[PDB]
Design a protein around this ligand. Structure first.
Ligand SMILES: Nc1ncnc2c1ncn2[C@@H]1O[C@H](COP(=O)(O)OP(=O)(O)O)[C@@H](O)[C@H]1O
Ligand SMILES: Nc1ncnc2c1ncn2[C@@H]1O[C@H](COP(=O)(O)OP(=O)(O)O)[C@@H](O)[C@H]1O
Lengths: 332, 333
């Protein structure tokens, strides 16, 4: 009876604690609201040098139960409620590059679905994960360092996707400085922090000193250089670029992308056709029959258009002929 | 007991200096007891000063800091938050020596005095009488010594080593450009002594922003005075292109150049890189001296790199000089 009575004591004390923090909860919410902001990190006795959201600066203190030793720069959390003194830490809130990756969301996760390129992936995997994950045979083979790969090919067919895929089999990173819209030399710090990184470029001539300037601008810092960062430049033509890049070896690797032949186009059209429903049998060769100058894209386009040409008749299986009017449509 | 009056600060003074102190950029210093401060908002504030603060960073107006409730100049802006974060003020040096350059020897000797000898033995000149000369240009054909190698070796036995390039000098947005070399020769000037590299200035790709920018490496080089501002070393591939205004053998002093290789440095510079490699049986010069009827300084770097890599695809640290031929056709053919 006393044991069961103390079980009832546990029930009554639990409900009484509920009414504790509800009662002092309704008197509690009459207090203040802490601010929030990124910082440049401390130097001295307490210290922060914050920059709060509306107006970006102050130097504040830190409470006893905060252990100013771990709170590192660009890791926003604050509480200087009224007098301006810290309390605790919050969600790291995605650092800088997390921004220009998710923002330029251009890079689309890719892995091994490259449509019939094996010499190309043998050569880029020869010079993009051997200088990262096995440096030991380079520091005993007498080689200094391989860095910088130029991807010249037709528009399409290997760009932004080979340099994506072998960047993420290796789980390296994939920084793209293609375009300078909203923010050089500061990017190197981010790459250095990542430790290992891969920088990618832009290819515009048609689908004066565009991005060969930054290209070398980071080969000047990259030549003497905290070492496993590998620039990648994609261009449509090898002849259009600078004579300064024509400086063997400034581009330790000139990988070549041909336009796809018959069987490689049945491989890429095999994969993009592995995106959807078809039927009991296609025998995809007749579509590849007129592949003649095609392009990587010229394959994703016709497979989506074959899907839509199956969608127009409210039909749930992509037949043979929707391919034939897809590739027979896009000859424009 | 000299450390007895230090603890009065944290009970009478740090109560003033130690609150949600605000930081606002300082302005025109009215005389000693006051100052004006535009805060973070834009509202000016005729603040007072502090007695115990050892004021040395008054320049109208680097980001001074303030008090929150009352307004003053409570502290100063150590942790400067250095503009041009990534300009290569080298702390971890690269890997080049007096030996691995090994080719052009006259030239590295001349730059070795022209930069290094006012540092490694500065007691020639004032005992002799002359001034030390300013920075050089060192132009050349492409790959003729790595122009940026005899400056890199001029790095690694000296003090700080600040660089620039034609690309950091020119600008897109700008309209307002010649700022880069304002505060590049202001940060450069401040170290006393640091060497500034106008890496490959060649200015190509309206035009008048480039004109004024060149006019400010020109004038901001030599306007009225200079600190220890040797190291203005300019690498160049096109000496006949840039405006001959830089050299008034004042703005740009004594300058040193080179023919591309000779065969003596085809051998002597060929056997530096492959000294790291493992080929030993048929190291040759017949495939090296008259092969390309002069091959750059790099083409031998790329022939060693592409040679060992091309014999490294088939996984052996062996001595094959027929794979070396596939490296030759592979890199320059
Ligand atoms: N071999 C291939 N395998 C898979 N996709 C390819 C291939 N070639 C081209 N593509 C298509 O190209 C697109 C990627 O664009 P990308 O090739 O980077 O442009 P560019 O051709 O300008 O480099 C993808 O949607 C992809 O389906
Ligand atoms: N002892 C040497 N002789 C000739 N060339 C060299 C030597 N050491 C390095 N180099 C090459 O010089 C290049 C860097 O400097 P440089 O040739 O002046 O390039 P650039 O002239 O384009 O600035 C590197 O590619 C390097 O392989």
């Amino acid at each position: 009876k006393s044991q069961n009575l103390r079980r009832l004591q546990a029930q009554r004390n639990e409900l009484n604690a509920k009414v504790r923090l509800l009662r002092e909860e309704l008197q509690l919410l009459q207090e203040q609201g802490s601010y929030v902001g990124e910082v440049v990190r401390a130097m001295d006795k307490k210290k922060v040098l914050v920059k709060v959201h509306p107006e970006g600066k102050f130097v504040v203190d830190v409470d006893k139960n905060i252990d100013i030793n771990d709170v590192t720069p660009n890791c926003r959390v604050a509480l200087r409620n009224d007098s301006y003194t810290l309390h605790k830490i919050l969600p790291n809130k995605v650092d800088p590059l997390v921004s220009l990756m998710m923002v330029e969301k251009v890079p689309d996760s890719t892995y091994e679905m490259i449509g019939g390129l094996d010499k190309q992936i043998k050569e880029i995997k020869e010079v993009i994960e051997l200088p990262v994950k096995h440096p030991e045979l380079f520091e005993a083979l007498g080689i200094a360092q391989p860095k910088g790969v130029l991807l010249y090919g037709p528009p399409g067919t290997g760009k932004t996707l080979l340099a994506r895929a072998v960047a993420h089999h290796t789980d390296c990173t994939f920084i793209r400085v293609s375009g300078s819209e909203l923010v050089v030399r500061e990017l190197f710090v981010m790459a250095r922090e990542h430790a290992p990184s891969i920088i990618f470029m832009d290819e515009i001539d048609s689908i004066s000193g565009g991005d060969s300037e930054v290209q070398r601008t980071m080969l000047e810092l990259l030549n003497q250089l905290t070492k496993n960062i590998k620039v990648i430049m994609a261009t449509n033509r090898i002849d259009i670029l600078d004579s300064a890049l024509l400086r063997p070896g400034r581009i330790d690797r000139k990988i070549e992308f041909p336009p796809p032949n018959e069987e490689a186009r049945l491989d890429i059209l095999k994969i993009h056709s592995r995106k959807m429903n078809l039927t009991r049998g296609i025998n995809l060769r007749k579509i590849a029959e007129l592949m003649p100058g095609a392009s990587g894209a010229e394959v994703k386009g016709v497979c989506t258009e074959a899907g839509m040409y199956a969608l127009r008749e409210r039909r749930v299986h992509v037949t043979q002929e929707d391919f034939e009017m897809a590739v027979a449509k896009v000859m424009q | 007991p000299l450390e007895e009056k230090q603890e009065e600060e944290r009970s009478k003074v740090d109560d003033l200096r130690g609150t949600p102190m605000s930081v606002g950029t300082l302005e025109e210093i009215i005389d000693d007891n006051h100052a004006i401060v535009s805060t973070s908002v834009g509202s000016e504030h005729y603040v007072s000063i502090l007695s115990f603060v050892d004021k040395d960073l008054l320049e109208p107006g680097c980001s001074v800091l303030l008090n929150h409730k009352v307004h003053a100049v409570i502290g100063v802006l150590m942790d400067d938050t250095d503009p041009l974060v990534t300009v290569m003020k080298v702390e971890k040096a690269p890997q080049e020596t007096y030996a691995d350059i090994g080719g052009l020897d006259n030239q590295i000797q001349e730059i070795k005095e022209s930069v290094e000898l006012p540092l490694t033995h500065p007691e020639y000149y004032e005992e002799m009488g002359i001034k030390p000369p300013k920075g050089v240009i060192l132009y050349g054909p492409p790959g003729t010594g790595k122009t940026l190698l005899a400056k890199a070796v001029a790095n690694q036995t000296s003090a700080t080593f600040l660089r620039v390039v034609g690309s950091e000098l020119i600008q897109k947005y700008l309209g307002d450009g010649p700022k880069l070399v304002r505060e590049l020769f202001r940060v450069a000037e401040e170290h006393a002594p640091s060497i500034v590299f106008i890496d490959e200035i060649d200015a190509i790709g309206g035009e008048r922003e480039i004109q004024r920018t060149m006019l400010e490496l020109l004038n901001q080089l030599d306007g009225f005075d200079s600190r220890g501002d040797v190291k203005v070393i300019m690498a160049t591939n096109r000496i006949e292109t840039l405006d001959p205004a830089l050299i008034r053998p004042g703005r740009i002093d004594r300058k040193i150049e080179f023919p591309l290789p000779d065969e003596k440095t085809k051998k002597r510079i060929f056997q530096i890189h492959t000294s790291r490699m493992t080929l030993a049986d048929d190291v040759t010069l017949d495939d090296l001296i008259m092969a390309k009827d002069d091959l750059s300084g790099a083409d031998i770097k790329a022939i060693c790199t592409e040679a060992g890599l091309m014999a490294l695809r088939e996984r052996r640290m062996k001595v094959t000089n027929e794979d070396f031929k596939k490296s030759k056709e592979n890199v320059l053919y």
